[PDB]
């Protein structure tokens, strides 16, 4: 399948080269997979989700995304226009308040929630969790992310936006999950992207168009935007049978575009998420 005039990041994920604008992907499109977006919520009524999104948990007065961040990330995973895996099922877990903040205790509970809740959902092609969030190093947050992964979920987490080594941030620094840095449309490391040995992969993160609340769209930047590209890619590849939740991060690294990015510090992978879709 070909989507013309796609957001640059979608085109990038299906290209060996920067500078193109069509997204190419197998029409299976993540059908039969599930992606949990653990964030500020998801505006499930957005036409872009086509009824494939739902809220399943909140820790706040409402399950509504009163921020937009979670809706944007969900859109990059799985919206019809802005998403990588256009037929996946999206599940929202609102661990962040409408100011985009959440206590680590809440974030941990949300991860353990997903590890159990997947057993209540129909995801025959597998389960992914996208965590476009984090803070300072916490062994408890990392352990929660490790449990979620161990439980059979492909966990993708943001590296963080500190232009610093991700070793000092969580859940970015948990080795066993898929830690995602950000790039721009010219294949530069995004200016804010964290880096370091713990990064597994980069994805598009600067100037990413996706869904927003109030049935709208906007472009924003961050490792929060790169993460759902990778989460959606994992779901897509799992639907194709090319990999599994346990192995998807490694598979994505194996099959990534190598050496394309600039300003990658020595000791950080130079790997850009790529679907290797050949029509």
């Amino acid at each position: 399948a070909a989507q013309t005039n796609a957001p640059w990041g979608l085109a990038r994920i299906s290209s060996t080269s920067p500078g193109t604008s069509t997204y190419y992907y197998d029409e299976s499109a993540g059908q039969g997979s599930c992606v949990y977006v653990i964030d500020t919520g998801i505006e499930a009524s957005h036409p872009e989700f086509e009824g494939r999104a739902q809220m399943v948990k909140t820790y706040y007065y409402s399950s509504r995304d009163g921020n937009g961040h979670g809706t944007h990330c969900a859109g990059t995973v799985g919206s019809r226009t802005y998403g990588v895996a256009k037929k996946t099922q999206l599940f929202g877990v609102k661990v962040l308040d409408d100011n985009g903040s959440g206590q680590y205790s809440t974030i941990i509970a949300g991860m353990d929630f997903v590890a159990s809740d997947k057993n209540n959902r129909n995801c025959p092609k597998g389960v992914v969790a996208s965590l476009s969030l984090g803070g300072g190093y916490s062994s408890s947050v990392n352990s929660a992310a490790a449990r979620l992964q161990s439980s059979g979920v492909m966990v993708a987490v943001a590296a963080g936006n500190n232009n610093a080594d991700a070793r000092n941030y969580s859940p970015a620094s948990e080795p066993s999950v898929c830690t995602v840095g950000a790039s721009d449309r010219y294949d530069r490391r995004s200016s804010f992207s964290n880096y370091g040995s713990v990064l597994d992969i980069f994805g598009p993160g600067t100037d990413i168009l996706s869904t927003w609340i109030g049935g709208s769209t906007r472009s924003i930047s961050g490792t929060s935007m790169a993460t759902p590209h990778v989460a959606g890619l994992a779901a897509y590849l799992m639907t194709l049978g090319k990999t599994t939740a346990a192995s998807a991060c490694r598979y994505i690294a194996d099959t990534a575009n190598k050496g394309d990015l600039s300003n990658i510090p020595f000791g950080t992978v130079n790997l850009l998420a790529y679907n290797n879709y050949q029509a």
């Binding site: 500020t40 962040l96 100011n99 903040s101 680590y104 974030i107 476009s132 984090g134 490792t223």
Partner: peptide
């Protein structure tokens, strides 16, 4: 605590 930008 928290995320990366109520972006």
């Amino acid at each position: 605590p928290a995320p990366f930008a109520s972006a």
